[PDB]
Write an enzyme that holds these catalytic residues in place. Structure first.
Site, PDB file in Angstrom:
ATOM      1  N   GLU A  99       0.842  -1.194   0.000  1.00  0.00           N
ATOM      2  CA  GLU A  99       0.000   0.000   0.000  1.00  0.00           C
ATOM      3  C   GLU A  99       0.872   1.237   0.000  1.00  0.00           C
ATOM      4  O   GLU A  99       0.592   2.201  -0.743  1.00  0.00           O
ATOM      5  CB  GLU A  99      -0.976   0.036   1.192  1.00  0.00           C
ATOM      6  CG  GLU A  99      -2.111  -0.974   1.030  1.00  0.00           C
ATOM      7  CD  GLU A  99      -3.123  -0.589  -0.029  1.00  0.00           C
ATOM      8  OE1 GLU A  99      -3.681   0.531   0.110  1.00  0.00           O
ATOM      9  OE2 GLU A  99      -3.330  -1.354  -0.995  1.00  0.00           O
ATOM     10  N   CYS A 132     -17.044   3.047 -19.666  1.00  0.00           N
ATOM     11  CA  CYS A 132     -18.282   2.676 -19.024  1.00  0.00           C
ATOM     12  C   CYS A 132     -18.857   1.349 -19.519  1.00  0.00           C
ATOM     13  O   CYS A 132     -19.520   0.670 -18.716  1.00  0.00           O
ATOM     14  CB  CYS A 132     -19.294   3.825 -19.192  1.00  0.00           C
ATOM     15  SG  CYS A 132     -18.741   5.412 -18.448  1.00  0.00           S
ATOM     16  N   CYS A 159     -17.879  -1.428 -17.315  1.00  0.00           N
ATOM     17  CA  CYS A 159     -18.042  -1.210 -15.879  1.00  0.00           C
ATOM     18  C   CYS A 159     -19.262  -1.871 -15.324  1.00  0.00           C
ATOM     19  O   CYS A 159     -20.368  -1.705 -15.888  1.00  0.00           O
ATOM     20  CB  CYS A 159     -18.139   0.304 -15.591  1.00  0.00           C
ATOM     21  SG  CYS A 159     -18.241   0.733 -13.825  1.00  0.00           S
TER      22      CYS A 159
HETATM   23  S1  SF4 Z   1     -18.522   4.354 -12.302  1.00  0.00           S
HETATM   24 FE1  SF4 Z   1     -18.408   2.972 -14.189  1.00  0.00          FE
HETATM   25  S2  SF4 Z   1     -20.261   3.647 -15.411  1.00  0.00           S
HETATM   26 FE2  SF4 Z   1     -19.802   5.296 -13.872  1.00  0.00          FE
HETATM   27  S3  SF4 Z   1     -18.417   6.829 -14.940  1.00  0.00           S
HETATM   28 FE3  SF4 Z   1     -17.067   5.283 -13.840  1.00  0.00          FE
HETATM   29  S4  SF4 Z   1     -16.643   3.737 -15.530  1.00  0.00           S
HETATM   30 FE4  SF4 Z   1     -18.463   4.870 -16.196  1.00  0.00          FE
END
Ligand code: SF4
EC number: 3.2.2.31
Length: 224
Positions: free
Chosen positions: A37, A199, A202
């Site tokens: 860490e 995204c 994600c």
């Molecule tokens: S949390 Fe996931 S869906 Fe939201 S901006 Fe970040 S990468 Fe994109």
């Protein structure tokens, strides 16, 4: 996104796509997690791995690190930058040898009392190495939480910091805390990046406010 859906989707993602084979994840101990860490605070994983391996070969236990000369520690750190980290690393090793008999302490207050270790690094050590129920809040985690829940404001202001810690606490589970906390660091490092987050990759994309509005550049806020 309700907090139980957040945690379940992140754990399901980690099982299939998460990083589980870093050296400080194999035969884990508080000492190995603390050392990794501190090295990772300001350095990329690929640069840290050879330094982590050299430090564990030369100092197999925290007492070995404590008893070594500081100049030797600084020589082995050369190339990682940010040497206050190294000076505090040696001091913390000495504090564990002196106050705790060479065995890493297992209560939040005693870990946070170590030099160079603050609230998030202390929670990281105890959750990742022993399964204790603490959340984390490094820059990777702050970016994922601030985008998913649309937290504007500079995290340098106390009220914004406080809101982000309450959100982290709310979504971090007890069962699977070591998997969840590593997954949040993985997401912020590899998917929810400062620029142009991925995204589509994600597991929070079905509930994230920044993704719904293509507004990731607003979160977290910058210093005014
Ligand atoms: S949390 Fe996931 S869906 Fe939201 S901006 Fe970040 S990468 Fe994109």
């Amino acid at each position: 996104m309700q907090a139980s859906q957040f945690s379940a989707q992140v754990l399901d993602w980690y099982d299939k796509y998460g990083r589980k084979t870093l050296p400080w994840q194999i035969d884990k101990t508080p000492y190995k997690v603390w050392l990794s860490e501190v090295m990772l605070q300001q350095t990329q994983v690929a640069t840290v791995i050879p330094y982590f391996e050299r430090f564990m070969a030369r100092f197999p236990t925290v007492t070995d690190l404590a008893n070594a000369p500081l100049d030797e520690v600084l020589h082995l750190w050369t190339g990682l930058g940010y040497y206050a980290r190294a000076r505090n690393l040696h001091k913390a090793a000495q504090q564990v040898a002196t106050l705790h008999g060479g065995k890493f302490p297992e209560t939040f207050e005693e870990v946070a009392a170590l030099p160079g270790v603050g609230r998030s690094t202390a929670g990281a050590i105890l959750s990742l190495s022993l399964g204790k129920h603490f959340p984390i809040l490094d820059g990777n985690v702050r970016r994922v939480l601030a985008r998913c829940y649309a937290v504007s404001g500079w995290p340098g202001k106390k009220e914004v910091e406080n809101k982000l810690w309450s959100l982290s606490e709310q979504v971090t589970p007890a069962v699977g805390v070591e998997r969840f906390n590593q997954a949040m660091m993985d997401l912020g490092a590899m998917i929810c990046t400062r620029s142009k987050p991925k995204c589509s990759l994600c597991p929070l994309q079905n509930g994230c406010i920044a993704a719904a509005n293509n507004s990731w550049a607003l979160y977290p806020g910058k210093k005014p």
